[PDB]
Amino acid sequence: DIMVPSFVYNKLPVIHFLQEKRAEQKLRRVLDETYTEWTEELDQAHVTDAITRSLNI
Amino acid sequence: VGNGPTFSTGGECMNTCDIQNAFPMNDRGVRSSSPFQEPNTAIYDSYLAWTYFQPMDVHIEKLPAPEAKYYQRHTKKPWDVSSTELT
Amino acid sequence: MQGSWSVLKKNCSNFFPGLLAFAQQTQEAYGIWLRIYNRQQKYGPTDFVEQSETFSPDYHKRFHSQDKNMWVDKELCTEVSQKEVARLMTYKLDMWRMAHCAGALLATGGYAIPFGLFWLANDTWVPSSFNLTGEELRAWREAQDLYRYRSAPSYLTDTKWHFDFHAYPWNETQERAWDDLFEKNDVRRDPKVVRPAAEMYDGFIKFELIRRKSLRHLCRSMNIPTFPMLARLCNGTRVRDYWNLAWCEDYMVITQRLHESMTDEELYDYAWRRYLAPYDKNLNREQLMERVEDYFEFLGPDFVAHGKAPNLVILTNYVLGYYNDPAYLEGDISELDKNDYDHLASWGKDAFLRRLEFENGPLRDQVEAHTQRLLAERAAIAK
Amino acid sequence: TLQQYRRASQDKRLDDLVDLLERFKPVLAREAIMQRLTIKHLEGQLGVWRYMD
Amino acid sequence: YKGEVPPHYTRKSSATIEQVEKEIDALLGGAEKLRKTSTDDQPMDKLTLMERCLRHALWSYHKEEGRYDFDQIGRWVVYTPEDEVKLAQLKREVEAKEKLAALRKR
Ligand SMILES: CCCCCCCCCCCCCCCCCC(=O)OC[C@H](COP(=O)([O-])OCC(O)COP(=O)([O-])OC[C@@H](COC(=O)CCCCCCCCCCCCCCCCC)OC(=O)CCCCCCCCCCCCCCCCC)OC(=O)CCCCCCCCCCCCCCCCC
Ligand SMILES: CCCCCCCCCCCCCCCCCC(=O)OC[C@H](COP(=O)([O-])OCC(O)COP(=O)([O-])OC[C@@H](COC(=O)CCCCCCCCCCCCCCCCC)OC(=O)CCCCCCCCCCCCCCCCC)OC(=O)CCCCCCCCCCCCCCCCC
Ligand SMILES: CCCCCCCCCCCCCCCCCC(=O)OC[C@H](COP(=O)([O-])OCC(O)COP(=O)([O-])OC[C@@H](COC(=O)CCCCCCCCCCCCCCCCC)OC(=O)CCCCCCCCCCCCCCCCC)OC(=O)CCCCCCCCCCCCCCCCC
Ligand SMILES: CCCCCCCCCCCCCCCCCC(=O)OC[C@H](COP(=O)([O-])OCC(O)COP(=O)([O-])OC[C@@H](COC(=O)CCCCCCCCCCCCCCCCC)OC(=O)CCCCCCCCCCCCCCCCC)OC(=O)CCCCCCCCCCCCCCCCC
Ligand SMILES: CCCCCCCCCCCCCCCCCC(=O)OC[C@H](COP(=O)([O-])OCC(O)COP(=O)([O-])OC[C@@H](COC(=O)CCCCCCCCCCCCCCCCC)OC(=O)CCCCCCCCCCCCCCCCC)OC(=O)CCCCCCCCCCCCCCCCC
Ligand SMILES: CCCCCCCCCCCCO[C@@H]1O[C@H](CO)[C@@H](O[C@H]2O[C@H](CO)[C@@H](O)[C@H](O)[C@H]2O)[C@H](O)[C@H]1O
């Protein structure tokens, strides 16, 4: 009725702070893993060159 | 404003306690008496210094109510007793 | 789970058939254990057979050593099958509880009858054999899962709090592993990220230094009776034997890929004996396979290579983390619009409260300025 | 032809985005709950039992 | 040059890109009042981080699909000078194709 409640009450702030920091860490890790994947596509100049070769030019 | 109490402090000054970092600091440099943010926290100097927070009427931008799905957890068990019921 | 009259009637009706089935299972499990023990004594390493002594560095108290006193029989499949191993494990649990009850009966004579009535009114400590139908078995499994839920969080908190209060991780990867190890079951933990915690805890505490209170919590979480607990080297031996059997079966399955061919119910039971898949979650085959594969990955390649599993304390924490459900939260958010200290409104504010409101209210800056100016004037006049 | 090639990336990315949205919603819910708790704390009508619940 | 069509993948959930974008807009619209701007070098907020991640994924998906809207791609996907170079390269290519088609038609 007295002791354990008081010590739980004393615990609450630090635990709240640590859990907030942990959530922020999770969000930060989520953000840090995001990278844009710039894709490279076959240049159409080679396609045009192959077209010309097929024409026997 | 009401006369109701607030988060208990134990007669301690949060600017010098061993867990001071857990208490947010406001602009004036006074750490809060609670994990919440307090703008008007003050310190009084009796034989020992102690922190105080005076409730006041302040408006805060209230985010719209979310759905029950994203904050309710129905993991209750027969032995579980809520803090309100215990009180 | 709390006792009830319906369960009492169920167990009373099935008491004698349950005892007969338990005796038959006892004969079968004795045969299986005879085979296993002969194989261990014949092909076991010298340290394992001779029961090498491992003493603590502080009080020199002997306890089982994971490396020496635990041995994985890679060639057990020739003599014993996986199903026989699972049967032996289930019978070991049932026999432990029956043995405790029988010891109480012998100790207290005929004065244990009312305590037996309490015992039969709950499925927590009755053998599986007392259930003769699917629904009864489901209720029994639900009771066991409830006990696991009740017990596991205490063990996890004990471990985490002691380590965090008395030590910290060395490097960032260890920090991440330690933090992610104790996440709730609602999120999926990557075993590769979590594994280094095993080595870190080996640096902190091994299975040979496990404290008696933590052991009691673990035995509670494994549905192992704890009264009379006695010395820590008895239930410790029980835990060692159970996990050694589980590791033998796991190696057999991994090598022979039996879980892929394993049926749905058998797979669910296999995961349950590893404390991975609660029955109340109604998991499907995909989830069970994911959890089992994660468990095998956590064991790591070295388990297959040499039969060496990671730290048993960390393994138990990892598996029991599936029973660490998210903290319950019931009630609509609208309830936050109410007030808790309305009953004090009639009392109002006294002189001190009014002074505090005036000094620390919106007019606080003006009051502070006036007070400081007055004090400065008084000090100047004094000088 | 290009659309067919860049399809599995698309489906997996869409599923990942949906999962990310579902993961972020609870954070906003918690933030709103903390906002309301702070509001009641500033009014001196918050009990520690309510905060723990 | 590419190779084989990648192995087929089955979606875990069913949802359209338009529905996802609408859901994102709804989620970010309720926090507009709470959302506060700040300097680029200053630390970011939760709302800002969520918005950046969601918009980055959405616009990467759109650019892969073919909806080349440079105005938003240059905002929600650019985080490296390499990315500015990529945007400039893509910007020239689209204009060149548009002009080439117009003259080839004319
Ligand atoms: C209603 C019933 C009433 C009953 C009353 C009787 C008492 C209770 C009964 C039992 C209750 C149940 C629980 C008991 C404790 C269980 C402990 C436990 O978990 O053990 C696990 C443990 C098993 O673990 P393990 O891994 O297999 O082995 C342990 C490891 O070695 C562990 O490794 P380690 O690293 O820890 O190694 C150390 C370990 C090593 O020890 C062991 O573990 C080995 C086993 C114990 C060996 C004990 C004998 C040692 C040699 C004695 C030599 C005596 C010579 C005297 C010559 C005299 C000539 C004149 O411990 C020691 O070193 C301890 C040594 C003992 C020191 C004794 C000091 C006594 C000081 C006395 C002061 C003065 C007294 C008053 C004055 C008297 C004179 C006027 O069990 C044992 O080893 C043995 C357990 C034995 C249990 C007790 C059996 C009781 C039998 C009672 C019969 C009589 C009944 C009378 C009834 C009367 C009417 C009602
Ligand atoms: C009539 C006199 C009465 C005297 C007073 C008694 C008062 C009550 C005290 C308790 C007595 C025993 C109660 C029955 C237990 C059932 C039998 C048994 O041991 O089960 C195995 C099981 C062994 O446990 P464990 O942890 O697996 O053993 C680890 C070993 O490494 C295991 O080694 P492992 O890994 O190689 O595996 C071996 C396993 C492999 O086998 C299997 O897996 C197959 C299954 C075999 C076991 C089957 C057990 C079935 C239990 C249920 C029976 C049906 C119950 C029906 C109830 C309803 C009836 C209507 O086979 C065994 O379990 C063999 C264990 C060693 C034999 C122990 C028995 C020794 C006493 C009997 C001989 C007495 C000779 C007297 C000569 C007199 C000369 C003058 O027993 C237990 O669960 C332990 C007992 C739990 C309660 C402890 C309560 C405190 C006891 C303190 C005693 C202190 C000394 C006495 C004085 C007390 C003063 C205060
Ligand atoms: C036919 C059947 C088949 C054959 C038989 C088979 C064998 C059967 C036997 C074996 C069965 C084993 C399994 C048993 C499981 C159930 C155990 C149990 O009790 O569970 C709790 C059980 C309920 O269990 P549950 O609801 O299923 O919940 C289980 C949960 O899992 C909760 O689980 P948990 O783990 O949280 O609960 C555990 C809890 C278990 O405990 C409890 O829950 C407490 C139970 C009692 C609570 C009483 C509350 C009410 C008090 C009322 C007071 C009077 C009111 C006014 C009455 C006015 C009347 C006119 O705590 C403990 O375990 C503590 C253990 C303490 C051990 C003490 C050891 C002392 C040793 C001494 C020191 C020695 C040192 C060495 C010295 C050496 C020297 C040489 O409690 C009850 O049912 C309460 C019954 C209350 C009866 C009425 C009040 C007492 C009436 C007394 C009448 C006296 C008449 C004569 C008077 C004469 C005057 C001259
Ligand atoms: C606001 C006021 C309210 C009212 C207050 C009332 C006043 C209280 C004031 C004092 C209170 C504190 C007293 C403390 C004393 C010192 C304790 C101490 O040193 O303990 C050390 C130590 C602590 O125990 P532990 O094993 O470390 O863990 C204890 C935890 O509670 C284990 O917890 P856990 O969570 O790990 O495990 C839970 C679960 C785990 O589940 C299991 O373990 C499965 C089920 C196991 C069933 C039991 C198996 C027993 C096997 C045999 C044990 C050895 C027997 C030795 C020979 C017999 C000796 C009599 O176990 C249970 O559920 C246990 C159920 C036990 C129910 C009975 C509890 C007592 C209720 C009252 C009944 C008796 C009333 C007599 C007086 C009235 C007569 C008219 O004790 C032991 O080593 C246990 C030795 C047990 C020996 C037998 C009992 C000897 C005492 C005399 C019995 C007389 C019977 C009379 C029958 C009727 C005659 C007419
Ligand atoms: C309603 C009230 C009614 C009246 C009640 C009257 C009460 C009388 C008050 C006086 C009683 C004092 C004794 C209290 C015992 C409980 C202490 C306790 O729980 O400590 C917790 C303590 C704290 O542990 P922790 O802090 O969690 O962890 C620390 C370590 O990590 C732990 O790690 P660990 O477990 O590895 O290390 C410990 C272990 C390490 O060692 C081992 O593992 C090796 C084991 C070696 C065993 C050696 C046995 C030698 C026996 C020789 C017999 C030869 C045959 C003789 C035959 C002819 C003569 C009869 O060594 C031991 O603990 C065993 C030491 C030797 C035990 C001897 C048997 C018990 C004697 C009890 C009577 C004492 C005198 C009483 C009168 C004076 C009082 C001032 O844990 C233990 O000690 C665990 C074992 C407990 C075993 C003793 C209790 C067994 C159950 C009793 C059954 C009989 C019930 C009778 C009921 C009577 C009712 C009237
Ligand atoms: C009241 C007491 C209750 C006791 C309950 C438990 C009883 C258990 C009995 C088990 C009997 C096992 O039987 C025993 O097994 C061992 C191990 O295979 C055999 O051991 C044999 O092979 C081993 C291994 O090569 C050799 O080290 C040993 O020298 C040789 O004798 C014994 O020859 C046999 O007799």
PDB file of C-alpha atoms and ligand atoms in Angstrom, chain C residues 61 212 230-232, ligand 5:
ATOM      1  CA  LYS C  61      28.898 -23.494  -6.213  1.00  0.00           C
ATOM      2  CA  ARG C 212      17.841 -19.025  -8.088  1.00  0.00           C
ATOM      3  CA  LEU C 230      14.956 -26.628  -3.019  1.00  0.00           C
ATOM      4  CA  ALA C 231      18.453 -26.040  -4.358  1.00  0.00           C
ATOM      5  CA  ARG C 232      18.882 -24.469  -7.780  1.00  0.00           C
TER       6      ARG C 232
HETATM    7  C1  LIG F   5       3.631 -22.516  11.615  1.00  0.00           C
HETATM    8  C2  LIG F   5       5.059 -22.738  12.036  1.00  0.00           C
HETATM    9  C3  LIG F   5       5.327 -24.141  12.554  1.00  0.00           C
HETATM   10  C4  LIG F   5       6.712 -24.337  13.157  1.00  0.00           C
HETATM   11  C5  LIG F   5       7.857 -24.088  12.184  1.00  0.00           C
HETATM   12  C6  LIG F   5       9.243 -24.283  12.783  1.00  0.00           C
HETATM   13  C7  LIG F   5      10.324 -23.485  12.072  1.00  0.00           C
HETATM   14  C8  LIG F   5      11.732 -23.733  12.581  1.00  0.00           C
HETATM   15  C9  LIG F   5      12.659 -22.549  12.379  1.00  0.00           C
HETATM   16  C10 LIG F   5      14.089 -22.912  12.002  1.00  0.00           C
HETATM   17  C11 LIG F   5      14.251 -23.409  10.573  1.00  0.00           C
HETATM   18  C12 LIG F   5      15.566 -23.000   9.917  1.00  0.00           C
HETATM   19  C13 LIG F   5      15.748 -23.549   8.512  1.00  0.00           C
HETATM   20  C14 LIG F   5      15.018 -22.774   7.427  1.00  0.00           C
HETATM   21  C15 LIG F   5      15.003 -23.488   6.086  1.00  0.00           C
HETATM   22  C16 LIG F   5      14.567 -22.630   4.912  1.00  0.00           C
HETATM   23  C17 LIG F   5      15.654 -21.683   4.425  1.00  0.00           C
HETATM   24  C18 LIG F   5      15.352 -21.090   3.082  1.00  0.00           C
HETATM   25  O1  LIG F   5      14.308 -21.209   2.502  1.00  0.00           O
HETATM   26  O2  LIG F   5      16.393 -20.404   2.605  1.00  0.00           O
HETATM   27  C19 LIG F   5      16.248 -19.831   1.285  1.00  0.00           C
HETATM   28  C20 LIG F   5      17.588 -19.818   0.603  1.00  0.00           C
HETATM   29  C21 LIG F   5      17.818 -18.542  -0.158  1.00  0.00           C
HETATM   30  O3  LIG F   5      18.266 -18.857  -1.492  1.00  0.00           O
HETATM   31  P1  LIG F   5      18.479 -17.679  -2.546  1.00  0.00           P
HETATM   32  O4  LIG F   5      18.824 -16.434  -1.822  1.00  0.00           O
HETATM   33  O5  LIG F   5      17.316 -17.682  -3.458  1.00  0.00           O
HETATM   34  O6  LIG F   5      19.749 -18.167  -3.375  1.00  0.00           O
HETATM   35  C22 LIG F   5      20.987 -18.410  -2.679  1.00  0.00           C
HETATM   36  C23 LIG F   5      21.754 -19.499  -3.391  1.00  0.00           C
HETATM   37  O7  LIG F   5      21.865 -19.166  -4.776  1.00  0.00           O
HETATM   38  C24 LIG F   5      21.128 -20.865  -3.254  1.00  0.00           C
HETATM   39  O8  LIG F   5      21.822 -21.791  -4.113  1.00  0.00           O
HETATM   40  P2  LIG F   5      21.903 -23.330  -3.701  1.00  0.00           P
HETATM   41  O9  LIG F   5      20.531 -23.822  -3.464  1.00  0.00           O
HETATM   42  O10 LIG F   5      22.761 -24.039  -4.680  1.00  0.00           O
HETATM   43  O11 LIG F   5      22.658 -23.277  -2.296  1.00  0.00           O
HETATM   44  C25 LIG F   5      22.045 -23.805  -1.101  1.00  0.00           C
HETATM   45  C26 LIG F   5      22.405 -25.257  -0.966  1.00  0.00           C
HETATM   46  C27 LIG F   5      23.770 -25.529  -1.529  1.00  0.00           C
HETATM   47  O12 LIG F   5      24.166 -26.864  -1.144  1.00  0.00           O
HETATM   48  C28 LIG F   5      23.761 -27.863  -1.925  1.00  0.00           C
HETATM   49  O13 LIG F   5      23.137 -27.711  -2.939  1.00  0.00           O
HETATM   50  C29 LIG F   5      24.174 -29.185  -1.362  1.00  0.00           C
HETATM   51  C30 LIG F   5      23.124 -29.773  -0.436  1.00  0.00           C
HETATM   52  C31 LIG F   5      23.721 -30.436   0.785  1.00  0.00           C
HETATM   53  C32 LIG F   5      22.691 -31.027   1.721  1.00  0.00           C
HETATM   54  C33 LIG F   5      23.283 -31.626   2.979  1.00  0.00           C
HETATM   55  C34 LIG F   5      22.266 -32.326   3.856  1.00  0.00           C
HETATM   56  C35 LIG F   5      22.878 -33.072   5.021  1.00  0.00           C
HETATM   57  C36 LIG F   5      21.890 -33.933   5.784  1.00  0.00           C
HETATM   58  C37 LIG F   5      22.547 -35.003   6.632  1.00  0.00           C
HETATM   59  C38 LIG F   5      21.581 -36.030   7.192  1.00  0.00           C
HETATM   60  C39 LIG F   5      22.245 -37.339   7.570  1.00  0.00           C
HETATM   61  C40 LIG F   5      21.277 -38.403   8.047  1.00  0.00           C
HETATM   62  C41 LIG F   5      20.921 -38.301   9.516  1.00  0.00           C
HETATM   63  C42 LIG F   5      19.920 -39.344   9.972  1.00  0.00           C
HETATM   64  C43 LIG F   5      19.806 -39.467  11.481  1.00  0.00           C
HETATM   65  C44 LIG F   5      19.408 -38.192  12.196  1.00  0.00           C
HETATM   66  C45 LIG F   5      18.046 -37.692  11.796  1.00  0.00           C
HETATM   67  O14 LIG F   5      22.442 -25.586   0.457  1.00  0.00           O
HETATM   68  C46 LIG F   5      21.284 -25.568   1.134  1.00  0.00           C
HETATM   69  O15 LIG F   5      20.502 -24.658   1.098  1.00  0.00           O
HETATM   70  C47 LIG F   5      21.106 -26.815   1.947  1.00  0.00           C
HETATM   71  C48 LIG F   5      21.749 -26.714   3.322  1.00  0.00           C
HETATM   72  C49 LIG F   5      21.492 -27.924   4.202  1.00  0.00           C
HETATM   73  C50 LIG F   5      20.025 -28.238   4.411  1.00  0.00           C
HETATM   74  C51 LIG F   5      19.760 -29.173   5.578  1.00  0.00           C
HETATM   75  C52 LIG F   5      18.316 -29.629   5.682  1.00  0.00           C
HETATM   76  C53 LIG F   5      17.381 -28.592   6.279  1.00  0.00           C
HETATM   77  C54 LIG F   5      17.559 -28.372   7.772  1.00  0.00           C
HETATM   78  C55 LIG F   5      16.484 -27.493   8.384  1.00  0.00           C
HETATM   79  C56 LIG F   5      16.551 -27.374   9.898  1.00  0.00           C
HETATM   80  C57 LIG F   5      17.701 -26.517  10.413  1.00  0.00           C
HETATM   81  C58 LIG F   5      17.718 -26.336  11.927  1.00  0.00           C
HETATM   82  C59 LIG F   5      16.430 -25.754  12.499  1.00  0.00           C
HETATM   83  C60 LIG F   5      16.494 -25.396  13.980  1.00  0.00           C
HETATM   84  C61 LIG F   5      17.395 -24.219  14.313  1.00  0.00           C
HETATM   85  C62 LIG F   5      16.935 -22.876  13.771  1.00  0.00           C
HETATM   86  C63 LIG F   5      17.820 -21.730  14.215  1.00  0.00           C
HETATM   87  O16 LIG F   5      17.607 -20.913  -0.363  1.00  0.00           O
HETATM   88  C64 LIG F   5      17.936 -22.134   0.085  1.00  0.00           C
HETATM   89  O17 LIG F   5      18.551 -22.333   1.096  1.00  0.00           O
HETATM   90  C65 LIG F   5      17.437 -23.199  -0.843  1.00  0.00           C
HETATM   91  C66 LIG F   5      17.387 -24.584  -0.213  1.00  0.00           C
HETATM   92  C67 LIG F   5      16.453 -24.689   0.977  1.00  0.00           C
HETATM   93  C68 LIG F   5      16.490 -26.048   1.650  1.00  0.00           C
HETATM   94  C69 LIG F   5      15.912 -26.073   3.058  1.00  0.00           C
HETATM   95  C70 LIG F   5      14.401 -26.180   3.119  1.00  0.00           C
HETATM   96  C71 LIG F   5      13.873 -27.521   2.656  1.00  0.00           C
HETATM   97  C72 LIG F   5      12.415 -27.768   3.004  1.00  0.00           C
HETATM   98  C73 LIG F   5      12.190 -28.233   4.430  1.00  0.00           C
HETATM   99  C74 LIG F   5      11.435 -29.551   4.529  1.00  0.00           C
HETATM  100  C75 LIG F   5      11.027 -29.927   5.943  1.00  0.00           C
HETATM  101  C76 LIG F   5       9.845 -29.135   6.468  1.00  0.00           C
HETATM  102  C77 LIG F   5       9.579 -29.325   7.945  1.00  0.00           C
HETATM  103  C78 LIG F   5       8.458 -28.451   8.475  1.00  0.00           C
HETATM  104  C79 LIG F   5       8.411 -28.362   9.989  1.00  0.00           C
HETATM  105  C80 LIG F   5       7.240 -27.563  10.521  1.00  0.00           C
HETATM  106  C81 LIG F   5       7.201 -27.515  12.030  1.00  0.00           C
END
